[PDB]
């Protein structure tokens, strides 16, 4: 749909494809998000979009997203996930990345929480995660950088690790588990106390544009 309002929902249980301009006031452009198949099997998307002004603030995160009952990420079993991509026009500040929120009480909304998980699968211009490079992981059979780093906003302090690949992996495949599992042995993450809430994926777009991000097909199951 030409849903290109400030935030728009598209699902089809349990997927979705949601438009998110939460920034569309530091900069200036436009930004739709069309659906190009949904069904409770997996989502395809793309969107098109031009930033300008506001370098260094995310003017938008359209992604899809799936819908699941909150659990304790010690009582998950596995997370797994596909992904197939492709970005037009590389030359923007952006980018892809899976998040993940969870929270110390799943009484609590879910735009944050404590903790927020991005798993980059590209990294476009000059932008960089939250933080400091804590570390190199390797986690489902291939190698990435660990980062740490904290924001508190309106008085929510949140809690951000970020794993970056060296080079986009427009093709991906594993479980996300594992990534949960790494943090819990080797960085202290209270997994027996923190509540998966969220589990989106798309892009975050600074600036740059007339560009194209499409997601030509992508699947993810909580269990
Ligand atoms: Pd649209
Ligand atoms: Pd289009
Ligand atoms: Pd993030």
Same mark, same amino acid.
Request: aromatic share 14%; with cysteine; charged share 15%.
């Given at each position: 749909?030409?849903?290109?309002?400030?935030?728009?929902?598209?699902?089809?249980?349990?997927?979705?494809?949601?438009?998110?301009?939460?920034?569309?006031?530091?900069?200036?452009?436009?930004?739709?998000?069309?659906?190009?198949?949904?069904?409770?099997?997996?989502?395809?998307?793309?969107?098109?979009?031009?930033?300008?002004?506001?370098?260094?603030?995310? @003017?938008?995160?359209?992604?899809?997203?799936? &819908?699941?009952? @909150? @659990?304790?990420?010690?009582?998950?079993?596995?997370?797994? &996930?596909?992904?197939?991509?492709?970005?037009?026009?590389?030359?923007?500040?952006?980018?892809?990345?899976?998040?993940?929120?969870?929270?110390?009480?799943?009484?609590?909304?879910?735009?944050?929480?404590?903790?927020?998980?991005?798993?980059?699968?590209?990294?476009?211009?000059?932008?960089?995660?939250?933080?400091?490079?804590?570390?190199?992981?390797?986690?489902?059979? @291939?190698?990435?950088?660990?980062?740490?780093?904290?924001?508190?906003?309106?008085?929510?302090?949140?809690?951000?690790?970020?794993?970056?690949?060296?080079?986009?992996?427009?093709?991906?495949?594993?479980?996300?588990?594992? *990534?949960?599992?790494?943090?819990?042995?080797?960085?202290? *993450?209270?997994?027996?106390?923190?509540?998966?809430?969220?589990?989106?994926?798309?892009?975050?777009?600074?600036?740059?544009?007339?560009?194209?991000?499409?997601?030509?097909?992508?699947?993810?199951?909580?269990?």
């Amino acid at each position: 749909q030409t849903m290109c309002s400030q935030y728009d929902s598209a699902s089809s249980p349990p997927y979705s494809v949601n438009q998110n301009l939460w920034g569309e006031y530091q900069g200036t452009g436009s930004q739709c998000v069309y659906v190009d198949k949904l069904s409770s099997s997996g989502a395809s998307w793309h969107t098109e979009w031009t930033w300008s002004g506001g370098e260094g603030t995310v @003017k938008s995160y359209s992604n899809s997203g799936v &819908t699941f009952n @909150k @659990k304790l990420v010690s009582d998950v079993s596995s997370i797994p &996930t596909s992904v197939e991509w492709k970005q037009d026009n590389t030359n923007v500040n952006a980018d892809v990345a899976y998040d993940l929120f969870t929270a110390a009480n799943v009484d609590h909304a879910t735009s944050s929480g404590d903790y927020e998980l991005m798993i980059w699968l590209a990294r476009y211009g000059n932008i960089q995660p939250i933080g400091k490079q804590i570390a190199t992981a390797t986690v489902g059979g @291939k190698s990435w950088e660990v980062w740490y780093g904290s924001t508190t906003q309106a008085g929510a302090e949140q809690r951000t690790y970020s794993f970056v690949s060296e080079s986009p992996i427009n093709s991906y495949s594993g479980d996300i588990n594992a *990534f949960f599992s790494y943090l819990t042995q080797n960085q202290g *993450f209270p997994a027996s106390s923190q509540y998966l809430i969220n589990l989106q994926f798309g892009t975050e777009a600074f600036t740059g544009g007339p560009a194209t991000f499409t997601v030509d097909n992508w699947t993810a199951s909580v269990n």
